[PDB]
């Protein structure tokens, strides 16, 4: 991302929202507006594409946002546009307007240090409203997250040091999200989420193995039935743990507590945890989401929004309501549990969460 002016009288356009007076606007048009001597318009809908699983349509992800930032800064830095207001626009559907609005908000949060109430004021009570974001599963939608949720989640993640666009590697991000290179994303400095490898090694499996070996993965957690031989991870010195539960279900809290204990053990030793389910989205979202809430105090909606900003489609169907209804439990564990000092066979000799009582006995 090239350097640009660090973010004049107002201009007034229909179907346009003012973000920065005289300089940054958000439009929605079903035609191509012509540039004037006072205005320059641009859209990324012809170049930046959300790849839907089913009926999910957004939000746009961190790689989309990074590419938007490059395109935006090139327009802002053009001497031709020195005394023009820049109008970022989308087509007029409520879904594409939601994507463009949320992506401009995430830009201002991550690149220009705006705060949530600053980026949300321009969008509040817009008529027609933006389409709320739905999950990626195949059932009828019954849980929505909003731009407010995504903005707060992305902002909180940035504040906690989980997002850093200065070190973000777009080419690595884009490569490894491909099915043929392993379908994974580095979610945070501590966590990778990935689709299960498959072994009848194929190219996606070797990509995962080499990336994991070179990027300090010290624990692989398997949440779905066996599609590969775990010996290949052990061959490169990475511990492998099963915490399997049924596709499309929510984990018993005992599973979540064991996962959080396992992850804490690995993090305190300075390693990453790579978690997979079949798709690396649903069951994986339940467990990593719980740990993020436990660690950083996200709301459930923020957590879902942040997770999908890095890896679209995480937390599927009823798992959304499950995360929502248990977010207090995950947060409460910081005060009601401790990392045990006895290893546990249930998590491969790592240290599980135990109550304050059993900790006093130890």
């Amino acid at each position: 991302i090239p350097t640009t002016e660090n973010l004049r009288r107002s201009v007034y356009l229909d179907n346009t929202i003012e973000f920065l007076r005289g300089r940054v606007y958000l439009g929605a048009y079903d035609y191509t507006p012509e540039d004037t001597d006072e205005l320059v318009f641009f859209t990324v809908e012809d170049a930046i594409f959300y790849n839907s699983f089913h009926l999910d349509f957004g939000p746009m992800n961190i790689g989309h946002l990074y590419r938007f930032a490059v395109i935006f800064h090139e327009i802002l830095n053009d001497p031709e546009n020195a005394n023009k207001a820049v109008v970022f626009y989308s087509s007029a559907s409520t879904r594409q307007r939601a994507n463009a609005a949320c992506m401009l908000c995430c830009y201002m949060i991550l690149v220009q240090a705006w705060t949530p109430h600053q980026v949300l004021q321009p969008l509040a009570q817009v008529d027609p409203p933006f389409m709320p974001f739905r999950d990626a599963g195949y059932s009828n939608a019954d849980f929505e997250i909003t731009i407010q949720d995504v903005v707060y989640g992305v902002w909180r993640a940035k504040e906690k040091g989980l997002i850093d666009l200065h070190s973000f590697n777009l080419e690595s991000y884009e490569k490894y999200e491909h099915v043929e290179f392993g379908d994974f994303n580095v979610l945070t400095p501590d966590f990778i989420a990935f689709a299960s490898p498959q072994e009848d090694l194929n190219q996606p499996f070797k990509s995962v193995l080499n990336f994991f070996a070179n990027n300090n993965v010290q624990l692989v957690v398997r949440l779905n039935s066996h599609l590969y031989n775990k010996k290949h991870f052990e061959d490169i010195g990475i511990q492998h743990l099963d915490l399997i539960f049924e596709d499309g279900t929510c984990p018993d809290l005992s599973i979540v507590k064991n996962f959080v204990g396992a992850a804490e053990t690995i993090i305190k030793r300075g390693g990453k945890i790579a978690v997979h389910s079949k798709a690396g989205l649903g069951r994986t979202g339940c467990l990593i989401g719980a740990h993020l809430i436990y660690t950083y105090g996200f709301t459930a909606n923020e957590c879902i929004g942040f997770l999908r900003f890095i890896r679209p489609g995480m937390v599927v169907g009823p798992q959304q309501h499950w995360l929502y209804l248990h977010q207090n439990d995950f947060r409460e564990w910081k005060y009601t549990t401790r990392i045990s000092l006895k290893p546990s066979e249930a998590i491969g000799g790592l240290y599980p969460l135990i109550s304050l009582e059993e900790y006093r006995l130890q």
Partner: peptide
């Protein structure tokens, strides 16, 4: 159709 969706 209740499971995780397929990337493709």
């Amino acid at each position: 159709e209740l499971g995780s969706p397929l990337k493709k």
